[PDB]
Amino acid sequence: EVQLVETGGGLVQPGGSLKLSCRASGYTFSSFAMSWVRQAPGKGLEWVSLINDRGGLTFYVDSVKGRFTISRDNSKNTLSLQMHSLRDGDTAVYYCATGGMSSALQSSKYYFDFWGQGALVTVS
Amino acid sequence: ENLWVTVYYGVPVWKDAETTLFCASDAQEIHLENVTEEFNMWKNNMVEQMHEDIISLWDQSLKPCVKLTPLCVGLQCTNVTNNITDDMRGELKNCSFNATTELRNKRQKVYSLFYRLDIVPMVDLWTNYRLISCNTSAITQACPKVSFEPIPIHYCAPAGFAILKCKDKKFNGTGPCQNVSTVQCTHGIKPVVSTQLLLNGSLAEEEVIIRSENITNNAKNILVQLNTSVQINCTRPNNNTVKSIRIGPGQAFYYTGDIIGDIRQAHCNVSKATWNETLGKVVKQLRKHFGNNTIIRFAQSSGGDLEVTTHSFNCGGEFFYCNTSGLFNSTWSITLPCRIKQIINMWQRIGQAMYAPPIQGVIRCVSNITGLILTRDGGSTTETFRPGGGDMRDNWRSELYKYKVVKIEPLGVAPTRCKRR
Amino acid sequence: SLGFLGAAGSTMGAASMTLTVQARNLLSGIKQLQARVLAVEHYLRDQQLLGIWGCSGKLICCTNVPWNSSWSNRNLSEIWDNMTWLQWDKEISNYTQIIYGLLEESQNQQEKNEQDLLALD
Amino acid sequence: SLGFLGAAGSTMGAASMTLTVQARNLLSGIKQLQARVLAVEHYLRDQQLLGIWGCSGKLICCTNVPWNSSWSNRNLSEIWDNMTWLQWDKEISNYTQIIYGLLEESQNQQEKNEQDLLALD
Amino acid sequence: SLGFLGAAGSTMGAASMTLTVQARNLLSQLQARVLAVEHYLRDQQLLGIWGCSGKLICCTNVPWNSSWSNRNLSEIWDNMTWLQWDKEISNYTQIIYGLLEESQNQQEKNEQDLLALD
Ligand SMILES: *[C@@H]1O[C@H](CO)[C@@H](O[C@@H]2O[C@H](CO)[C@@H](O[C@@H]3O[C@H](CO)[C@@H](O)[C@H](O)[C@@H]3O)[C@H](O)[C@H]2NC(C)=O)[C@H](O)[C@H]1NC(C)=O
Ligand SMILES: *[C@@H]1O[C@H](CO)[C@@H](O[C@@H]2O[C@H](CO)[C@@H](O)[C@H](O)[C@H]2NC(C)=O)[C@H](O)[C@H]1NC(C)=O
Ligand SMILES: *[C@@H]1O[C@H](CO)[C@@H](O[C@@H]2O[C@H](CO)[C@@H](O)[C@H](O)[C@H]2NC(C)=O)[C@H](O)[C@H]1NC(C)=O
Ligand SMILES: *[C@@H]1O[C@H](CO)[C@@H](O)[C@H](O)[C@H]1NC(C)=O
Ligand SMILES: *[C@@H]1O[C@H](CO)[C@@H](O)[C@H](O)[C@H]1NC(C)=O
Ligand SMILES: *[C@@H]1O[C@H](CO)[C@@H](O)[C@H](O)[C@H]1NC(C)=O
Ligand SMILES: *[C@@H]1O[C@H](CO)[C@@H](O)[C@H](O)[C@H]1NC(C)=O
Ligand SMILES: *[C@@H]1O[C@H](CO)[C@@H](O)[C@H](O)[C@H]1NC(C)=O
Ligand SMILES: *[C@@H]1O[C@H](CO)[C@@H](O)[C@H](O)[C@H]1NC(C)=O
Ligand SMILES: *[C@@H]1O[C@H](CO)[C@@H](O)[C@H](O)[C@H]1NC(C)=O
Ligand SMILES: *[C@@H]1O[C@H](CO)[C@@H](O)[C@H](O)[C@H]1NC(C)=O
Ligand SMILES: *[C@@H]1O[C@H](CO)[C@@H](O)[C@H](O)[C@H]1NC(C)=O
Ligand SMILES: *[C@@H]1O[C@H](CO)[C@@H](O)[C@H](O)[C@H]1NC(C)=O
Ligand SMILES: *[C@@H]1O[C@H](CO)[C@@H](O)[C@H](O)[C@H]1NC(C)=O
Ligand SMILES: *[C@@H]1O[C@H](CO)[C@@H](O)[C@H](O)[C@H]1NC(C)=O
Ligand SMILES: *[C@@H]1O[C@H](CO)[C@@H](O)[C@H](O)[C@H]1NC(C)=O
Ligand SMILES: *[C@@H]1O[C@H](CO)[C@@H](O)[C@H](O)[C@H]1NC(C)=O
Ligand SMILES: *[C@@H]1O[C@H](CO)[C@@H](O)[C@H](O)[C@H]1NC(C)=O
Ligand SMILES: *[C@@H]1O[C@H](CO)[C@@H](O)[C@H](O)[C@H]1NC(C)=O
Ligand SMILES: *[C@@H]1O[C@H](CO)[C@@H](O)[C@H](O)[C@H]1NC(C)=O
Ligand SMILES: *[C@@H]1O[C@H](CO)[C@@H](O)[C@H](O)[C@H]1NC(C)=O
Ligand SMILES: *[C@@H]1O[C@H](CO)[C@@H](O)[C@H](O)[C@H]1NC(C)=O
Ligand SMILES: *[C@@H]1O[C@H](CO)[C@@H](O)[C@H](O)[C@H]1NC(C)=O
Ligand SMILES: *[C@@H]1O[C@H](CO)[C@@H](O)[C@H](O)[C@H]1NC(C)=O
Ligand SMILES: *[C@@H]1O[C@H](CO)[C@@H](O)[C@H](O)[C@H]1NC(C)=O
Ligand SMILES: *[C@@H]1O[C@H](CO)[C@@H](O)[C@H](O)[C@H]1NC(C)=O
Ligand SMILES: *[C@@H]1O[C@H](CO)[C@@H](O)[C@H](O)[C@H]1NC(C)=O
C-alpha cells in the first residue's frame, strides 16, 4: 500500500564505515516509527535498530550500540543508518520498515508492518 | 487497550464563568479555528458590571463637588424679556433669588435664567417657583472643568480568564458562533448614555441586525443595529452668556447670565432621505420575524416620563430631550425640537440629582445614529413599533453582545498508554 | 506558535503540544487587587492538586491509575486524533472527581511504598 | 476519611495517612483580602521551605539528616504508635530550627554533589 | 553566611553557594504583597516550564552558544560576579529562556514515550 525504497552501498573493508538510507512514499512518514532489520544470507531475521516517529528516541541491540547510529529526517521523508567498525559478520541484507513502537497516544503495535525492498551490505 | 490516566496541565479548554473585569484606557487577538461557541448576550454579566462601574464612577466624579444647598430657596420668576420665538414662550424664566456668599451673614440678589422643566410652581405670596428636586433630594453641582464626553474604555479579564469575541456577520446575539477569537481586553467602548437612538458605537458590517430576546414577547426591547450611520446635527442656537458667583468658602455656583440675541429652540437635524432609507432597511430586516405581508407601523413613544418618551443625550455638557415624533411616524431634512434640562436624574435613581452647569456660547454636536431601541405593541395584520429605552443596559448590550467571559480550566485527564513507575 | 487557546479547536493530540503556551497565561483599585488574588488562588489550587498527585513541576504527568472503560469507551485513535479537548472536557464532566480521588489515593500508596523502599537497608 | 483534622487525636503513624486531607484545606473588603493574602503567604512560605529541603511535590519527604538523640531519645515504638503529632510538636518545637538549618545545608550539599555527578562525561 | 545579597560582590563560583539565603528573602500594603507573590510565582512557573521544578541549581540539555558569551569557565565562575554576568547576557536572556522551554517540551514527550514501552 506504501512504497519504501532503500539505497545501499558497496564493498567496505573491516574497520570502515557505510551509510544506508531509506525513502518513504504513500503515507505520512512523521506519523510512524521506523526500524532497521538485518537478515544474513543464510540465516533468519534479526532486529537491529528502532527509531520513534519524531527521531528523538533510538534503540539498538547490545552488539551495535557503540557502532551503529540511526537517524531520521521528517522533512525529507528519509532514514539513514551510519555503521562504523563493520566486520565480516555484518554482511547481510538490511531492510527499513514502518512499525515497531507507537508514541503513547496511538494504539499499541509492537510489530513491523510495511517493509522495503532490501539493501545489500557486503564486508570484505 | 490497558489505558492509564495521564494528567495534563495547560489544557486549552474553558467553562462559562462570571468574574470581575478591570478597566483599561489608552493613556492581542487570536482567531480560534474550528471553535464553535454558544453566546447569550442576555445573560452576559459584562453588562451588569459595566452598568455598576459607570454608576460608581459617575458617583465618584460628582461626590467632591458643590452641594448647592443655598439654591433650595424661593424664586421670584418672571418672563424673559428678550425676543422669544413662537415655540419657546414659557420655556425659560428669569428667576431672582437671595443667594448666600462667603460671609455667613451676607446675601446677594442673583438673577438667573432657569428652564421651565427645572422649576415647579408653588402658591407662596411673594415667590412663584422652586427647584423641582428640592422636595426629593439635595442637588449636587457637577464640578466645573470636568468633561462628560464618553472616553473609550476597555474591559480586561483577570489572568486565568479570557474574553471570547464573536466575529460572525449577521449575529443575532444568541446561539452558536463559528468565527470566534480570544482577546484579553475588549475594543474601546464609549459609555454613551442616551435613549431611543444609539448614537456612537459599533456599526453592523453587512445588514441591519434585529437583535432581541423572545421576539414574540412584545414586552422585551428590540435592539436594531444599523449597518450605515445616520448623521444627526444637534444644535442649541442661543449665545449663552454664563455668570458665576460664590455661595460659600471654597464654593462656586454657575448659572445662565443672559442670552445674546434672539432666543431660539434647540433642534436636531436628521436627513429625511437617509432616515427614510434607514427605516426601509429596518423594515426589510424586520418582516423576517413577522411575515412578508404584515404591515409594519412606526409611532411615537407614547407613555412614560420625559426621560423615556424623548431622545435624551449629553451634547457638549447640556442634556437634550428631543421629541422624536418625525422619525417614528410611518406605515410600511427632519427637524426635531429639543428641550434642554439642567436638573438631571440619570438612570432610574430618584434621590441622586445633579445640576448641569451651563456652557458659554452655542453648542453644536455632530453624532451618528448606529442603532435603535424599539418596543412593540401587544395584542393581527398590523404591527406598531415605538421608541423605547431608559433602562440603559441596552445601550451597553448593543456593544457587549459579541463578548463572553470564560474561565480557563488548564487541568485535565486523558487515557494514554503510559504507566508511571 | 498559534498563541493562547489557539489550539482549542484542534485535536487534543495536536493541542497537547501547546501546554506551555496555555500555562504561561494563567498568572499574567480594589477590583484589581481582588482579581489578582483570585488568579493567584486558582493557580495555587491547581498546583496543589497536581502536587498531591505526584505531578508537581510537570505539564504531562503519567500516572498508574487504570482507565475505566465506563468513563469513556473510546479508542486512542478516536480520543486523540478525532476529538478536541473541549469535547472531551464536556464528555467527562462526570467522573472527573472519581478520577481525582483515585489519583490522590494512588499517590498516597506510592508515597508509602517509596518510604518503605528507601528505609529498606 | 475522618475529615479535616479528624486524625488530630490519632497516633502519628495513623495520622500520617491523612496528609492530603489537611493539605487540601490550606488554600480554601480589605479585611478579607488581608486574610486571603496571609493564607497565600503562609502556604508559599511552607512550599518554599519544602523546596529548599529538596522535598517539593511530596507530602512524605525522606532526608539525609541523621536524628540527634538529644532532640528526642524516644524510639519508633513510642513516637509513631503511642504519641500524637501535637505532643510531638510540643516536644520538638525547641529543636525545629536546628533541624530546618540542617535540612537546608544537607540539600545544598546534595545539589552540589548532583551537579558534579552530572558533570562527568 | 554573609547575609542577604552579601555575596553580590563575590564571584559567581562563591555566590552560587549562597542561593538559599537569597531564596528565603523573596517572600518575607496589599498591592505590595500581591506583587511580591506574583513575581515569586512567575519565577517558579518559569522554573516549572523548564525541568527545574524544585531545584535551585538545575542542569539542562541546552548547549551554550559561543555567540551569547565566549568566555571560558575560568573567567565566568572564578573572576566574574553575577551582576557583571547578568549585564553581559541581558541581550540574549529571552532567547535562552525560549530554548529552555523547547528542550523541556521535547523531554516530556520523550519521557511519555519511554514510559509507554511495555
Ligand atoms: C458622538 O461622537 C461625536 C464625535 O466625537 C461627538 O461630537 C464631539 O463631541 C465633543 C464633546 O466634547 C466635541 O468636543 C468639543 O468641541 C468643541 C469645539 O468647539 C470644544 O470647544 C469643546 O471643548 C470640546 O472639545 C467634538 O468637537 C464633537 N465632534 C464633532 C465632530 O462635532 C458626539 O458628542 C458624540 N455623541 C455623544 C452623545 O456623546
Ligand atoms: C436644520 O435645517 C433647517 C432647515 O429647515 C435649518 O434652518 C435654517 O437655518 C439657517 C441658519 O441660519 C437659517 O438661515 C435658515 O433660514 C433656516 N431655515 C428655515 C427654513 O428656518 C437649521 O438651522 C438646521 N439645523 C442644524 C442644526 O443644522
Ligand atoms: C412631542 O411629543 C408628543 C408626544 O411625546 C407628540 O404628540 C402629542 O402628544 C400629546 C399628548 O400625548 C397630544 O396632546 C398632542 O396632540 C400630540 N401631538 C399631535 C400633533 O398629535 C407631539 O406631536 C410632539 N411634538 C411635535 C411638534 O411633533
Ligand atoms: C431679568 O430681570 C432683570 C431685572 O432687573 C433684568 O435686568 C434682566 O435683563 C432680565 N433678564 C432677561 C434675560 O431679560
Ligand atoms: C409669560 O409667558 C406666558 C407664556 O404662555 C404667558 O402666558 C404669560 O402671560 C406671560 N406673562 C407676562 C407677564 O407677559
Ligand atoms: C415634589 O413636588 C412635585 C410637584 O408636582 C410632586 O409631583 C412630587 O411627587 C414631589 N416629590 C416628593 C418626593 O414629594
Ligand atoms: C472571521 O472574521 C474575520 C474578521 O475580519 C475574517 O477576516 C475571517 O475571514 C473570518 N473567518 C471566517 C472563517 O469566516
Ligand atoms: C460617524 O460616522 C461616520 C461615517 O459617516 C464615521 O466616519 C465616523 O467615524 C463615525 N463616528 C463615530 C464617533 O462613530
Ligand atoms: C446595508 O444593508 C443593506 C441591506 O438592504 C444593503 O443594501 C446596504 O448596501 C448595506 N450597506 C453597507 C454599507 O454595507
Ligand atoms: C437568534 O438566532 C437563533 C439561532 O438559532 C434563533 O434560534 C433565534 O430565534 C434568533 N432570535 C432572533 C430574535 O432573531
Ligand atoms: C417567550 O416567553 C413566553 C412566556 O410565556 C413563552 O410562552 C414563549 O414561548 C417565549 N418564546 C420564546 C421564543 O422564547
Ligand atoms: C456671543 O456674544 C459674544 C459677545 O461678545 C461674542 O463674543 C461671541 O462670539 C458670540 N457667540 C456667538 C456664537 O455668536
Ligand atoms: C447636517 O446634516 C446634514 C444631513 O443632510 C449633513 O449633510 C450636514 O453636513 C450636517 N451638518 C454638519 C455641520 O455636519
Ligand atoms: C481545523 O480543521 C481543519 C480540517 O482539516 C484542519 O486542517 C485545521 O488544522 C484545523 N485547525 C487547527 C487550528 O488545527
Ligand atoms: C469501573 O466503574 C464501575 C462503575 O459502575 C465499577 O463497577 C467498576 O468496578 C470499575 N472498574 C474498575 C476496574 O475499577
Ligand atoms: C476506533 O473506534 C472506532 C469506533 O467505531 C472504530 O470505528 C475505529 O475503526 C477504531 N480505530 C481503530 C484504529 O481500531
Ligand atoms: C452526568 O450525570 C447526570 C446524572 O443525572 C446526567 O444527567 C448527565 O447527563 C451526565 N452527563 C454526561 C455528560 O454524561
Ligand atoms: C482514640 O483512642 C482510642 C483508644 O483505644 C482509639 O481506639 C481510637 O481509635 C482513638 N481515636 C482516633 C480518632 O484515633
Ligand atoms: C547533636 O548531637 C551531637 C553528638 O552527636 C552533639 O555534639 C550536639 O551538641 C547535638 N546537638 C544539640 C543541639 O545538642
Ligand atoms: C523502646 O520503646 C519501648 C516502649 O515501646 C521502651 O520501653 C524502651 O525503653 C525503648 N527503648 C529504647 C529507647 O532504647
Ligand atoms: C498509649 O497507650 C496506652 C495503653 O493503655 C493508651 O491508654 C494511651 O491512650 C496511648 N496513647 C495514645 C496517645 O494513643
Ligand atoms: C524549650 O526552651 C525553653 C527555654 O528555657 C524551656 O523553658 C522549655 O522547657 C524547653 N522545652 C523543652 C520541651 O525542653
Ligand atoms: C572581596 O574581594 C576579596 C578579594 O579577594 C575577597 O577576599 C572577598 O572574599 C570578597 N568579598 C566577598 C563578600 O566575597
Ligand atoms: C548560535 O546562534 C547562532 C545565531 O544565528 C546560530 O546560527 C548558531 O547555530 C547557534 N549555535 C549553537 C551551537 O546553538
Ligand atoms: C580563558 O580565556 C582567557 C582569554 O582572555 C585566557 O587568558 C585564559 O587563560 C583562558 N582560560 C584557560 C583556563 O585557559
Ligand atoms: C578578571 O581578572 C582580572 C585580574 O586582573 C581583573 O582585572 C578583571 O577585571 C577581571 N574581570 C572582570 C570582568 O571583572
Ligand atoms: C544590549 O542592548 C543594549 C540596548 O538594548 C545595547 O546598548 C548593548 O550594546 C547590547 N549589547 C549586546 C552585547 O548586544
The helix-helix angle for D30-52 and D96-117 (nearest 10°) equals: 60
Task: Give the residue among B306, B163, B165, B170 at the shortest CA–CA distance from B225.
Answer: B170
Closest CB from D34, D41, D112 relative to E37: D41
- Say if residue E72 is exposed, middle or buried (CB neighbours under 10 Å; 0-12, 13-18, 19+): exposed
> Which value, to the nearest 10 degrees, does the dihedral of the CA atoms of residues C28, C30, C34, C40 take?
40
Q: Which ligand is nearest to the CA of B83?
A: 4
Calculate ∠ Cα A64-A66-A68, nearest 5°.
Answer: 55
Using DSSP, how many helices (H) and how many strands (E) does chain D show? 6, 0
Alpha carbon B55 to its chain centroid, in Å, reads 12
For residue B203, the SS3 value is coil
Task: Give the residue among E108, B5, E96, A18 at the shortest CA–CA distance from C72.
Answer: B5
Q: Which three cell numbers stand for residue D91?
A: 516536644
For residue C96, the SS3 value is helix
Which distant-in-sequence residues (6+ apart) come within 8 Å of B27 by Cβ? none
Please tell me what DSSP assigns to residue A89. G
Please tell me what DSSP assigns to residue B204. P
**Residue matched to cell numbers 538559599:** E20
CB B3 within 8 A of CB B413: no
CA of residue D90 to ligand 22 center, whole Å: 10
- B405 vs C6: CA distance, rounded Å: 16
**Residue matched to cell numbers 489505558:** B3
Sheet order of strands, B180-183 included: B14-16, B403-408, B161-166, B180-183, B29-32
- Best residue of E17, E21, E25, E27 to probe chain D, by most D CBs closer than 10 Å: E27
Task: Give the residue among B45, B48, B27, B51 at the shortest CA–CA distance from B152.
Answer: B27
Closest CB from A104, A108, A110 relative to E113: A104
CB B165 within 8 A of CB B138: no
- Pairing type for strands B4-9 and B411-416 reads antiparallel
CA atoms within 13 A on the CB side of B140: 15
Q: Which three cell numbers stand for residue B189?
A: 467602548
CB C28 within 8 A of CB E38: yes
CA distance D15 to chain C (A): 13
CB atoms near residue E84 (< 10 Å): 12
- B93 vs B107: CA distance, rounded Å: 22
- B158 vs C38: CA distance, rounded Å: 8
* Residue with CA at minimum distance from ligand 6 atom 2: B135
CB B296 within 8 A of CB B283: yes
Calculate ∠ Cα B321-B326-B329, nearest 5°.
Answer: 120
CA of residue B135 to ligand 6 center, whole Å: 6
Categorise residue B79: left if φ over 0, alpha if ψ from -120 to 50, beta otherwise.
beta
How far is the first Cα of chain D from the last one, in angstroms, to the nearest whole number?
Answer: 50
CB C27 within 8 A of CB B383: no
CB A48 within 8 A of CB A38: yes
Chain C residues with CB-CB distance to D50 below 8 A: none
* Residue with CA at minimum distance from ligand 18 atom 7: D10
Task: Give the residue among B258, C66, E57 at the shortest CA–CA distance from D110.
Answer: E57
CB atoms near residue B182 (< 10 Å): 25
CB B155 within 8 A of CB B23: yes
Calculate ∠ Cα A36-A39-A42, nearest 5°.
Answer: 175
- C68 vs C102: CA distance, rounded Å: 11
Q: Which three cell numbers stand for residue B342?
A: 439642567
Number of C/D CB contacts below 8 angstroms equals 52
Please tell me what DSSP assigns to residue C19. H
| Binding-site residues, ligand 22, Cβ < 6 A | D 91, 94
Return the exposure string of C26-60: e unless at least 16 CB atoms fall within 10 Å of the residue's CB, then b. bbeeeeebbbbbbbbbbbbebbbbbbbbbbbbbbb
Q: Which three cell numbers stand for residue B117?
A: 422643566
Ligand 17 close to Cβ of residue C94 (< 6 A): yes
Categorise residue C27: left if φ over 0, alpha if ψ from -120 to 50, beta otherwise.
alpha
Which distant-in-sequence residues (6+ apart) come within 8 Å of E12 by Cβ? E76, E77, E80, E81, E82, E85
- D47 vs D41: CA distance, rounded Å: 10
- B283 vs B372: CA distance, rounded Å: 13
Helical H segments across B257-313, by residue range: 272-286, 306-309
Please tell me what DSSP assigns to residue B117. G
CA of residue B232 to ligand 13 center, whole Å: 7
Closest CB from D37, D51, D111 relative to E33: D37
Element (H, E) at B24: strand B22-24
Task: Give the residue among C14, D73, C28, E72 at the shortest CA–CA distance from B162.
Answer: C28
Ligand 19 close to Cβ of residue D96 (< 6 A): no
**What technique solved it?**
cryo-EM
DSSP per-residue string spanning B135-197: TT--EEEPPTT-------BEEEPPTTEEEEEE--TT--SEEEESSEEEESB---B-----SSE
Q: What is the number of domains present in chain D?
A: 1
- The phi and psi torsions of B158 (rounded to 5 degrees) equal -65, 160
For residue B415, the SS3 value is strand
Q: Which ligand is nearest to the CA of B31?
A: 7
Which runs of E-coded beta strand occur in B261-325?
266-270, 295-298, 311-315, 318-322
SS3 content of chain C, % helix, strand, coil (to 5): 60, 5, 35
Amino acid in position B179? N
Counting ligand 12 atoms within 8 A of each CB, the residue from B239, B243, B362 with the most, and so the one to mutate, is: B239
Ligand 17 atom closest to Cα of residue C94: 1
Calculate ∠ Cα B17-B23-B28, nearest 5°.
Answer: 75
CB A123 within 8 A of CB A41: no
CA distance A51 to chain E (A): 12
| Interface membership of A106 toward C (CB under 8 Å) | yes
Q: Which three cell numbers stand for residue B249?
A: 468658602
Chain E residues with CB-CB distance to A103 below 8 A: 109, 113, 116
CB B165 within 8 A of CB B33: no
| Interface membership of E113 toward A (CB under 8 Å) | yes
How far is the first Cα of chain C from the last one, in angstroms, to the nearest whole number?
Answer: 50
Categorise residue D11: left if φ over 0, alpha if ψ from -120 to 50, beta otherwise.
beta
CB B99 within 8 A of CB B108: yes
| Nearest C-alpha in D relative to E37 | D41
Residues of chain A numbered 72-101 and touching chain E (CB < 8 Å): 101
Ligand 19 close to Cβ of residue D68 (< 6 A): yes
CA of residue B271 to ligand 9 center, whole Å: 17
Contact E109 A101 (CB under 8 A): no
* Residue with CA at minimum distance from ligand 18 atom 4: D10
Contact E113 A101 (CB under 8 A): yes
Contact A105 C16 (CB under 8 A): yes
Closest CB from C58, C85, C96 relative to B11: C85
DSSP per-residue string spanning chain E: ---TTTTTTSBHHHHTT-HHHHHTTS---HHHHHHHHHHHHHHHHHHHHTT-SS-SS---SPPPPTTT----HHHHTTT-BHHHHHHHTHHHHHHHHHHHHHHHHHHHHHHHHHTT--
Closest CB from B3, B9, B21 relative to C19: B9
Chain B residues with CB-CB distance to A102 below 8 A: 417
CB atoms near residue E29 (< 10 Å): 8
- Cα A27 to Cα A3, A37, B201, C20: the distances in Å are 9, 20, 53, 30
Return the exposure string of D49-65: e unless at least 16 CB atoms fall within 10 Å of the residue's CB, then b. bbbbbbbbbbbeeeeeb
The β-bridge partners of B11 are none
- B78 vs B124: CA distance, rounded Å: 15
> Which value, to the nearest 10 degrees, does the dihedral of the CA atoms of residues A24, A26, A32, A36 take?
-30
Which distant-in-sequence residues (6+ apart) come within 8 Å of D104 by Cβ? D52, D53, E20
CA distance C16 to chain E (A): 10
* Residue with CA at minimum distance from ligand 7 atom 7: B167
Ligand 11 close to Cβ of residue B217 (< 6 A): yes
Using DSSP, how many helices (H) and how many strands (E) does chain B show? 4, 31
- Cα B251 to Cα B144, B183, B205: the distances in Å are 11, 46, 50
Helical H segments across B300-348, by residue range: 306-309
- Say if residue B122 is exposed, middle or buried (CB neighbours under 10 Å; 0-12, 13-18, 19+): exposed
For residue D34, the SS3 value is helix
Resolution, expressed in angstroms to one decimal? 3.2
The helix-helix angle for C30-51 and D30-52 (nearest 10°) equals: 30
- The phi and psi torsions of B408 (rounded to 5 degrees) equal -85, 135
CA of residue C100 to ligand 17 center, whole Å: 18
- Pairing type for strands A111-115 and A3-7 reads unpaired
- B19 vs C36: CA distance, rounded Å: 12
Which distant-in-sequence residues (6+ apart) come within 8 Å of B228 by Cβ? B203, B274, B278, B281
CA atoms within 13 A on the CB side of A74: 13
- Give residue E38's domain range: 1-117
